Amino acid sequence: QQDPDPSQLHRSSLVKNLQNIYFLYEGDPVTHENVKSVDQLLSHDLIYNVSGPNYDKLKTELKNQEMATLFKDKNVDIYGVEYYHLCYLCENAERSACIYGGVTNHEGNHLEIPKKIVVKVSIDGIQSLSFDIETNKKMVTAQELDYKVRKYLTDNKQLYTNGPSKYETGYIKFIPKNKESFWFDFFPEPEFTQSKYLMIYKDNETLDSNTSQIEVYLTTK
């Protein structure tokens, strides 16, 4: 049994300040095209000189040093859900943003036309809702896909709100073409930190956009 069970899943009704998870998926994601790491804090992270409405430096934390050097100084694209609480490169990183993973090679990884993907959503067992998600990458991180999914469901199904969720449990499952499938829980532990919760993107898991499937499971009450 690789897939979770009722008891394994976190209940949104026990979470304090679940609005923090809400603000992460409701707001825009950090996206950048064809950039190169300019610095490094620890051996398993990389820093980029890119900018967004609230930052001019972005620090991504990857699986380990091997993955960091694998992408260091190499031309890559960034797609990630960022946080600010407890993020900085010292008392000399006034406007930094942090994320985990969300890194993909830029060269030869784009599609002419976006590749739409169906997201099968089940609620209390009943698979009663399906929608489309799209990407421009041949190899897209699970994080990019995940965000687009939770963003859509946050706007259209109140998966998240500045407060409670109308759902009790929920989780996203990715089914790779031949590799093993994996999942992420939509809700954190009762007392959590944005930084700890986002570690789920730390492994930088990437997928083949043309052959991967996505499944969401929600429970109400």
Add this chain to the structure above:
Amino acid sequence: QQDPDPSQLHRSSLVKNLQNIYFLYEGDPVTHENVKSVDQLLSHDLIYNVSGPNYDKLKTELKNQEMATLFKDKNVDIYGVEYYHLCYLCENAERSACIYGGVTNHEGNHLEIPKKIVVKVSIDGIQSLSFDIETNKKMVTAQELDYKVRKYLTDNKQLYTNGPSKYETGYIKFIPKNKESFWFDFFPEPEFTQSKYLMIYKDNETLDSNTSQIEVYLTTK
């Protein structure tokens, strides 16, 4: 206190990451009308349960323990220049904003007609620039007027930019009706932090909007 000394003024040409001062005065200030503090980290601060983009909890550092309990149970108005780096580090509040002072009692501090105040500006000794500023508060913090003067000079005379300033030095001089006058240096020391610099507002100095005057002195590179 006594007017600044030519050699006592910080030079923007020496500042590292001056764009950090830019973002402070370019973006919107934090303002709230009828609110009572809700919590308190240290005895000299007050936490408010108000929000804006990026934050839903605001912490203001006042002069001392005495000033905080003075407003603790009061409905007040807020007007401050907020920062986030090294703001509220307690993994139980991940969306806090921080300002210094900027507090005034709400009750009976409102004018039916806004008070215009003439800000006179000198550039290299020549007083060649005048422009109005306004407030609704009978008693207004120096911080509010200071922010309005910089935002205006930032968007109209290039006081700050996402890079260097066209001015090497510059200070704002407040001249209360009877009390001693005082000033604030528009620029920080070479290496600094938004948190440190903003301490110029920690005393929460408030002026009479009807009898106070403002003077600005800048020099070109």
